[PDB]
Tab-separated table of N, CA and C in Angstrom:
chain	number	residue	atom	x	y	z
A	2	UNK	N	-19.933	-18.938	-44.957
A	2	UNK	CA	-19.666	-17.339	-43.815
A	2	UNK	C	-17.897	-17.653	-43.785
A	3	UNK	N	-17.431	-16.210	-43.368
A	3	UNK	CA	-16.473	-15.800	-43.842
A	3	UNK	C	-15.742	-16.101	-42.695
A	4	UNK	N	-14.256	-16.239	-42.831
A	4	UNK	CA	-13.066	-16.670	-41.808
A	4	UNK	C	-13.309	-15.845	-40.427
A	5	UNK	N	-12.437	-16.848	-39.433
A	5	UNK	CA	-12.747	-15.662	-38.480
A	5	UNK	C	-11.571	-14.618	-38.523
A	6	UNK	N	-11.497	-13.458	-37.507
A	6	UNK	CA	-11.273	-12.568	-37.538
A	6	UNK	C	-9.516	-12.678	-37.051
A	7	UNK	N	-9.009	-11.686	-37.436
A	7	UNK	CA	-7.433	-11.361	-36.500
A	7	UNK	C	-7.345	-11.293	-35.013
A	8	UNK	N	-6.154	-12.197	-34.680
A	8	UNK	CA	-6.223	-12.370	-32.845
A	8	UNK	C	-6.117	-10.590	-32.164
A	9	UNK	N	-6.688	-10.712	-30.861
A	9	UNK	CA	-6.918	-9.994	-30.446
A	9	UNK	C	-5.874	-9.138	-30.287
A	10	UNK	N	-5.704	-8.041	-29.355
A	10	UNK	CA	-4.602	-7.228	-29.010
A	10	UNK	C	-3.410	-7.655	-27.650
A	11	UNK	N	-2.927	-7.433	-27.541
A	11	UNK	CA	-1.767	-8.356	-26.333
A	11	UNK	C	-2.416	-7.653	-25.222
A	12	UNK	N	-2.632	-7.669	-24.108
A	12	UNK	CA	-3.241	-7.099	-22.977
A	12	UNK	C	-1.878	-6.531	-22.686
A	13	UNK	N	-2.376	-6.080	-21.254
A	13	UNK	CA	-1.571	-4.563	-20.390
A	13	UNK	C	-0.591	-5.687	-19.951
A	14	UNK	N	0.541	-4.955	-18.961
A	14	UNK	CA	1.266	-5.638	-18.787
A	14	UNK	C	0.729	-5.962	-17.379
A	15	UNK	N	1.274	-7.203	-15.826
A	15	UNK	CA	0.485	-7.212	-15.430
A	15	UNK	C	1.183	-5.624	-14.112
A	16	UNK	N	0.368	-6.266	-13.042
A	16	UNK	CA	1.218	-5.045	-11.670
A	16	UNK	C	2.545	-5.468	-11.090
A	17	UNK	N	3.379	-4.847	-10.506
A	17	UNK	CA	4.520	-4.604	-9.789
A	17	UNK	C	4.493	-5.680	-8.511
A	18	UNK	N	4.855	-7.023	-8.784
A	18	UNK	CA	4.946	-7.858	-6.991
A	18	UNK	C	5.183	-6.805	-5.971
A	19	UNK	N	4.826	-7.782	-4.927
A	19	UNK	CA	4.267	-6.726	-4.412
A	19	UNK	C	5.880	-6.961	-2.781
A	20	UNK	N	5.963	-5.929	-1.905
A	20	UNK	CA	6.864	-6.008	-1.524
A	20	UNK	C	7.843	-7.590	-1.039
A	21	UNK	N	8.785	-8.026	-0.656
A	21	UNK	CA	9.246	-9.318	0.202
A	21	UNK	C	8.406	-9.739	1.176
A	22	UNK	N	9.401	-10.427	1.620
A	22	UNK	CA	9.130	-11.071	2.675
A	22	UNK	C	9.765	-10.136	3.852
A	23	UNK	N	8.966	-10.056	5.135
A	23	UNK	CA	9.913	-9.276	6.138
A	23	UNK	C	10.955	-9.563	6.745
A	24	UNK	N	11.741	-9.116	6.527
A	24	UNK	CA	13.360	-9.841	7.304
A	24	UNK	C	13.266	-10.831	8.705
A	25	UNK	N	14.357	-11.749	8.848
A	25	UNK	CA	14.225	-12.324	9.743
A	25	UNK	C	14.335	-11.628	11.243
A	26	UNK	N	13.444	-11.750	12.256
A	26	UNK	CA	14.330	-10.995	13.381
A	26	UNK	C	15.636	-10.997	13.894
A	27	UNK	N	16.436	-10.223	14.354
A	27	UNK	CA	17.836	-9.587	15.054
A	27	UNK	C	18.492	-10.381	15.520
B	1	UNK	N	-16.561	-12.465	-45.409
B	1	UNK	CA	-15.429	-11.852	-45.268
B	1	UNK	C	-14.783	-11.941	-44.083
B	2	UNK	N	-13.106	-11.795	-43.683
B	2	UNK	CA	-13.238	-12.141	-42.594
B	2	UNK	C	-13.892	-11.180	-41.098
B	3	UNK	N	-13.714	-12.268	-40.098
B	3	UNK	CA	-14.644	-11.575	-38.665
B	3	UNK	C	-13.360	-10.391	-38.394
B	4	UNK	N	-14.195	-9.071	-37.126
B	4	UNK	CA	-13.577	-8.372	-37.080
B	4	UNK	C	-12.043	-8.815	-35.645
B	5	UNK	N	-11.057	-8.356	-35.488
B	5	UNK	CA	-10.588	-8.592	-34.592
B	5	UNK	C	-11.243	-9.538	-33.169
B	6	UNK	N	-9.992	-10.115	-32.402
B	6	UNK	CA	-10.394	-10.766	-31.053
B	6	UNK	C	-10.807	-9.362	-30.090
B	7	UNK	N	-11.044	-10.035	-28.885
B	7	UNK	CA	-11.420	-9.162	-27.654
B	7	UNK	C	-9.791	-9.010	-27.484
B	8	UNK	N	-9.261	-8.387	-26.696
B	8	UNK	CA	-7.945	-7.773	-25.789
B	8	UNK	C	-7.627	-8.921	-25.009
B	9	UNK	N	-6.139	-8.958	-24.902
B	9	UNK	CA	-5.836	-9.981	-24.016
B	9	UNK	C	-6.353	-9.667	-22.600
B	10	UNK	N	-5.746	-10.853	-21.653
B	10	UNK	CA	-6.228	-10.179	-20.631
B	10	UNK	C	-4.952	-10.063	-19.907
B	11	UNK	N	-4.658	-8.705	-18.890
B	11	UNK	CA	-3.623	-8.064	-17.382
B	11	UNK	C	-2.844	-9.328	-17.644
B	12	UNK	N	-1.614	-9.513	-17.693
B	12	UNK	CA	-0.624	-9.857	-17.314
B	12	UNK	C	0.007	-10.600	-15.999
B	13	UNK	N	-0.268	-10.990	-15.654
B	13	UNK	CA	0.364	-11.851	-13.948
B	13	UNK	C	0.976	-10.768	-13.294
B	14	UNK	N	0.394	-10.564	-12.307
B	14	UNK	CA	1.461	-9.780	-11.013
B	14	UNK	C	2.892	-10.183	-10.792
B	15	UNK	N	3.593	-9.163	-10.934
B	15	UNK	CA	5.194	-9.405	-10.561
B	15	UNK	C	5.309	-10.492	-9.150
B	16	UNK	N	6.409	-11.203	-9.272
B	16	UNK	CA	6.840	-12.329	-8.119
B	16	UNK	C	7.016	-11.439	-6.956
B	17	UNK	N	7.110	-11.410	-5.874
B	17	UNK	CA	7.388	-10.699	-4.625
B	17	UNK	C	8.937	-10.535	-4.577
B	18	UNK	N	9.705	-9.320	-3.747
B	18	UNK	CA	10.575	-9.224	-3.953
B	18	UNK	C	11.135	-9.791	-3.009
B	19	UNK	N	12.300	-9.594	-2.696
B	19	UNK	CA	13.089	-10.817	-1.713
B	19	UNK	C	13.448	-10.546	-0.260
B	20	UNK	N	13.594	-11.454	0.491
B	20	UNK	CA	13.173	-10.994	2.192
B	20	UNK	C	13.854	-9.454	1.938
B	21	UNK	N	13.598	-8.748	3.504
B	21	UNK	CA	14.004	-7.599	4.303
B	21	UNK	C	15.457	-7.830	4.858
B	22	UNK	N	16.356	-7.017	5.062
B	22	UNK	CA	17.239	-7.782	5.859
B	22	UNK	C	17.011	-7.966	7.407
B	23	UNK	N	17.861	-8.852	7.966
B	23	UNK	CA	18.282	-9.102	9.173
B	23	UNK	C	17.038	-7.838	10.086
B	24	UNK	N	16.894	-7.972	11.271
B	24	UNK	CA	16.719	-6.785	12.163
B	24	UNK	C	18.263	-7.252	12.744
B	25	UNK	N	18.358	-5.700	13.449
B	25	UNK	CA	19.701	-5.317	13.770
B	25	UNK	C	20.090	-6.695	15.414
B	26	UNK	N	21.596	-6.925	15.219
B	26	UNK	CA	22.108	-6.949	16.709
B	26	UNK	C	21.078	-6.754	17.597
B	27	UNK	N	21.437	-5.698	18.275
B	27	UNK	CA	20.761	-4.677	19.015
B	27	UNK	C	19.383	-4.794	19.013
C	2	UNK	N	-20.075	-11.218	-41.786
C	2	UNK	CA	-18.434	-12.009	-42.270
C	2	UNK	C	-18.437	-13.086	-40.848
C	3	UNK	N	-16.987	-13.464	-40.608
C	3	UNK	CA	-16.782	-14.446	-39.897
C	3	UNK	C	-16.845	-13.930	-38.278
C	4	UNK	N	-16.868	-14.622	-37.337
C	4	UNK	CA	-16.950	-15.261	-36.147
C	4	UNK	C	-15.565	-13.778	-35.863
C	5	UNK	N	-15.745	-13.407	-34.483
C	5	UNK	CA	-14.475	-12.739	-34.384
C	5	UNK	C	-13.185	-13.541	-34.028
C	6	UNK	N	-12.408	-13.396	-34.335
C	6	UNK	CA	-10.447	-13.262	-33.803
C	6	UNK	C	-10.306	-14.465	-32.519
C	7	UNK	N	-9.665	-14.913	-31.922
C	7	UNK	CA	-9.468	-15.035	-31.005
C	7	UNK	C	-9.135	-14.477	-30.276
C	8	UNK	N	-8.710	-14.105	-29.073
C	8	UNK	CA	-8.079	-13.538	-27.786
C	8	UNK	C	-7.231	-13.743	-28.169
C	9	UNK	N	-6.530	-12.024	-27.278
C	9	UNK	CA	-5.352	-11.497	-28.322
C	9	UNK	C	-4.631	-12.201	-26.499
C	10	UNK	N	-3.286	-12.025	-26.908
C	10	UNK	CA	-2.313	-12.979	-25.987
C	10	UNK	C	-2.720	-12.127	-24.465
C	11	UNK	N	-2.687	-12.585	-23.388
C	11	UNK	CA	-2.345	-12.418	-21.976
C	11	UNK	C	-0.925	-11.334	-21.966
C	12	UNK	N	-1.119	-10.637	-21.428
C	12	UNK	CA	-0.290	-9.233	-21.207
C	12	UNK	C	1.364	-9.767	-20.510
C	13	UNK	N	2.701	-9.475	-20.276
C	13	UNK	CA	2.888	-10.094	-20.092
C	13	UNK	C	3.538	-9.708	-18.269
C	14	UNK	N	4.282	-10.285	-17.102
C	14	UNK	CA	4.267	-10.494	-15.918
C	14	UNK	C	4.597	-9.166	-15.640
C	15	UNK	N	4.215	-8.882	-13.880
C	15	UNK	CA	4.480	-7.095	-14.397
C	15	UNK	C	5.989	-7.842	-13.728
C	16	UNK	N	6.825	-5.921	-13.270
C	16	UNK	CA	7.747	-6.210	-12.577
C	16	UNK	C	8.240	-6.938	-11.158
C	17	UNK	N	9.637	-7.659	-10.727
C	17	UNK	CA	9.047	-8.184	-8.938
C	17	UNK	C	9.039	-6.458	-8.331
C	18	UNK	N	8.246	-7.398	-7.291
C	18	UNK	CA	8.270	-6.314	-6.247
C	18	UNK	C	9.509	-6.122	-5.776
C	19	UNK	N	9.699	-4.666	-4.396
C	19	UNK	CA	10.981	-4.744	-3.783
C	19	UNK	C	11.090	-5.362	-2.891
C	20	UNK	N	12.788	-5.308	-2.004
C	20	UNK	CA	12.737	-5.467	-0.908
C	20	UNK	C	11.445	-5.627	0.465
C	21	UNK	N	11.657	-6.566	0.924
C	21	UNK	CA	10.492	-6.525	2.038
C	21	UNK	C	10.855	-5.497	3.116
C	22	UNK	N	10.222	-5.050	4.744
C	22	UNK	CA	10.676	-4.196	5.255
C	22	UNK	C	11.855	-5.341	6.198
C	23	UNK	N	12.290	-4.298	6.623
C	23	UNK	CA	13.499	-4.934	7.933
C	23	UNK	C	12.906	-5.414	8.561
C	24	UNK	N	13.658	-6.702	9.246
C	24	UNK	CA	13.212	-7.649	10.089
C	24	UNK	C	13.304	-6.756	11.397
C	25	UNK	N	12.762	-6.466	12.425
C	25	UNK	CA	12.411	-6.659	14.185
C	25	UNK	C	14.239	-6.612	14.951
C	26	UNK	N	14.607	-5.705	15.265
C	26	UNK	CA	15.821	-5.492	16.126
C	26	UNK	C	15.628	-7.268	17.055
């Protein structure tokens, strides 16, 4: 049988991160 | 003959969280 | 033909998130 195929396409970029923590109480 | 290409890769990790918000005002 | 190739590489990490909301007064 033949060799394995080439590597697949690179995945999509991740989603942007969430907003940061709420700031401290004043 | 070589096989077909592998599957597309997985989606990347979500970005890190942003920094803390500003403090509340003194008043 | 041979087997499928290796899975593609994982995607890049997303962009960092925005600043958090303001703290309470």
